[PDB]
Amino acid sequence: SGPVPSRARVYTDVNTHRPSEYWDYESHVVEWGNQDDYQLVRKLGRGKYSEVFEAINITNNEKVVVKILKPVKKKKIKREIKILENLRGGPNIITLADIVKDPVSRTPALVFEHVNNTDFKQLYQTLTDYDIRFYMYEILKALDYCHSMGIMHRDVKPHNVMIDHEHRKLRLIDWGLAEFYHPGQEYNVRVASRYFKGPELLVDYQMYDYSLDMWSLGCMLASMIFRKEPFFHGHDNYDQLVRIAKVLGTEDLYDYIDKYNIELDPRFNDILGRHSRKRWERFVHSENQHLVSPEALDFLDKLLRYDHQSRLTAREAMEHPYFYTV
Amino acid sequence: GPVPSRARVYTDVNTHRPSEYWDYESHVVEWGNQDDYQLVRKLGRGKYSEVFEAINITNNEKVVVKILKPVKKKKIKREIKILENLRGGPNIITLADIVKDPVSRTPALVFEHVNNTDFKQLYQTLTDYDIRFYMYEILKALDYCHSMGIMHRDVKPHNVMIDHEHRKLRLIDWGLAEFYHPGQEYNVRVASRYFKGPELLVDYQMYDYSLDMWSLGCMLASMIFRKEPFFHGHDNYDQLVRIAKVLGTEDLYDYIDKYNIELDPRFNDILGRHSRKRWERFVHSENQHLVSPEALDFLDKLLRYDHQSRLTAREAMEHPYFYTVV
Numbered sequence A: 001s002g003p004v005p006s007r008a009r010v011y012t013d014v015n016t017h018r019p020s021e022y023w024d025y026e027s028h029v030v031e032w033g034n035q036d037d038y039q040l041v042r043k044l045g046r047g048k049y050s051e052v053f054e055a056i057n058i059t060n061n062e063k064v065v066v067k068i069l070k071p072v073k074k075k076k077i078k079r080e081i082k083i084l085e086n087l088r089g090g091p092n093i094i095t096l097a098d099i100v101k102d103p104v105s106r107t108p109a110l111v112f113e114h115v116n117n118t119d120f121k122q123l124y125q126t127l128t129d130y131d132i133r134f135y136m137y138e139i140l141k142a143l144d145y146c147h148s149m150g151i152m153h154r155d156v157k158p159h160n161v162m163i164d165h166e167h168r169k170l171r172l173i174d175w176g177l178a179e180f181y182h183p184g185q186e187y188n189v190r191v192a193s194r195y196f197k198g199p200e201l202l203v204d205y206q207m208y209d210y211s212l213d214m215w216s217l218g219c220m221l222a223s224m225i226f227r228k229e230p231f232f233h234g235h236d237n238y239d240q241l242v243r244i245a246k247v248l249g250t251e252d253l254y255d256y257i258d259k260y261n262i263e264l265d266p267r268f269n270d271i272l273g274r275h276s277r278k279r280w281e282r283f284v285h286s287e288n289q290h291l292v293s294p295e296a297l298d299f300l301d302k303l304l305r306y307d308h309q310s311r312l313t314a315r316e317a318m319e320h321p322y323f324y325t326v
Numbered sequence B: 001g002p003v004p005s006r007a008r009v010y011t012d013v014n015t016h017r018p019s020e021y022w023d024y025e026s027h028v029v030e031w032g033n034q035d036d037y038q039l040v041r042k043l044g045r046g047k048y049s050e051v052f053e054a055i056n057i058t059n060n061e062k063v064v065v066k067i068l069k070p071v072k073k074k075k076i077k078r079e080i081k082i083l084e085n086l087r088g089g090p091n092i093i094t095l096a097d098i099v100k101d102p103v104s105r106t107p108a109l110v111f112e113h114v115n116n117t118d119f120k121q122l123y124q125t126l127t128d129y130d131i132r133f134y135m136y137e138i139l140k141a142l143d144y145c146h147s148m149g150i151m152h153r154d155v156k157p158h159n160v161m162i163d164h165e166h167r168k169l170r171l172i173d174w175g176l177a178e179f180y181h182p183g184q185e186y187n188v189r190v191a192s193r194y195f196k197g198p199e200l201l202v203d204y205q206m207y208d209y210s211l212d213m214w215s216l217g218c219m220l221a222s223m224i225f226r227k228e229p230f231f232h233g234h235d236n237y238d239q240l241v242r243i244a245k246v247l248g249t250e251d252l253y254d255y256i257d258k259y260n261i262e263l264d265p266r267f268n269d270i271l272g273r274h275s276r277k278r279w280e281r282f283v284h285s286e287n288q289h290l291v292s293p294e295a296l297d298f299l300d301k302l303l304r305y306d307h308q309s310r311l312t313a314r315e316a317m318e319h320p321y322f323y324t325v326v
């Protein structure tokens, strides 16, 4: 008849039991403050529908980050703002400080706490096996919190994780794709960045949950311990599933899609092939062995599962032996 | 002639901004189609506008439609520009659309719907706290619009829509609002009689945002003392006399001397001599529950003849009267 329904094993009804105002971002009233209080200093980068700037709040001489949004979709701006407001103050969540709009331009801008970022590549060289544990625990704090608040980030990747290694501070940012979890709801699968996309998205299984973020986090952990960036290197969304199948095997992939009665896209049949399930110790080499341990591999194995229901939740992951040292 | 004056705050916000932001005469107005809106009932009738509750048929959401009698096109452009400039500001009525009826070609402004609680029910059950709360909400609107270089120039109870059930307040009716430019001489035929600042009544044209602070003072006094209106003039000359009966003729002569104001000969036989009355004189059994030393200290700092001596909206927000509000 169609796909088998699914629901989160944790924080299932947190949004249902809350008032309409909290989860309805379309009805949320956005109060745009004056942009004069902020003086833009330099461009920090340029995203798809946003330009980020380092700025100074002239009213208190404090550094801030200003994300000038290309207002391509209003509903999307409202969702992000609402989620940021909802999560404001949460552990390791980027703090939205202000919502402003420049008076002639009338372009929406989000003002955040400033983070002194340590480069992905630069941090990578000096990252110890403990450091991977510590920061992975810090991300888990952010995820367990946002999941407990009925929100799935849906865009977990190293670019969205800001780290100040000098102060051992981590912030989960870029909430633009984030969404309110509602049990039974069917979500758009065109979320997350290709390498971090969960199997559910690639096979077009819409009734996904917070566990999506746990797959993404698994991909990040895999890339870190093994020093293989990205871990699953798809060249497109179809190939992405093949790259996962080359590691997890095609047997468990068919068991997954059968369990949820998923109609596999015709473009898959000719590229998927047949693949054995690979051991996690196969990726261990001389360049990465110092960051790899049985605990790390046991933890990774419990994150990188086809079955979204079978993956550890953020809270279960926090209790894993891998983190006994943090 | 009269000594020049300028605002103590947001003096050159407009000057340092481009021509497009404040030249409303050059602003390009794009009139949408009125067919998206179905009028429900008349909410009231102003001088050059008729307001209606309406339904946006494309989304079944209620909206407010202000049909404007097009006596002057320059004024309509000014309002539209100001509304567009302020759109999204805290407690500012949100302009949602600008439409013309296809056959009538009459200009109409579409705003976000506000459910206004019945004034009579609200007036009797209002408490000391509700006044502090709603006053702070108006201050948010004023500090914001003054920050954007705009003086409302028509602050009065009628232009403050309050939804008590949801504790929502909107400052509306921007038809008399104007861009502040330091040194500019404005038309004094603005605001509503009871709310007209001394500067308007003595024909002192170089006024600023502080005009709105006097008007707010009139509302506050009316609220805490349960006297409506507080200064009950029967005309614009008598209006100054009503103020003089409270503030005293001594300070009135100090004011007009400070700015070298030529007092109209019509004031000669009506002004008289009046002593400075203590604010405690207006306290009675019917209003003593809404009055406090903080309230009287705050009111005293708003109802000043000298427009430069009145608290700015930001200073007013920092007053001890609001120490009990978020």
Ligand SMILES: Clc1cc(CNCCc2ncc[nH]2)ccc1-c1ccccc1
Pocket: B043, B044, B116, B119, B122, B130, B131, B134, B135, B156, B157, B158, B159, B160, B161, B162, B219, B220, B223
């Ligand atoms: Cl300003 C005002 C206004 C109202 C209601 N205004 C009615 C506005 C209206 N009615 C129809 C169209 N617009 C109620 C209370 C207040 C008020 C509340 C606290 C302190 C001072 C004043």
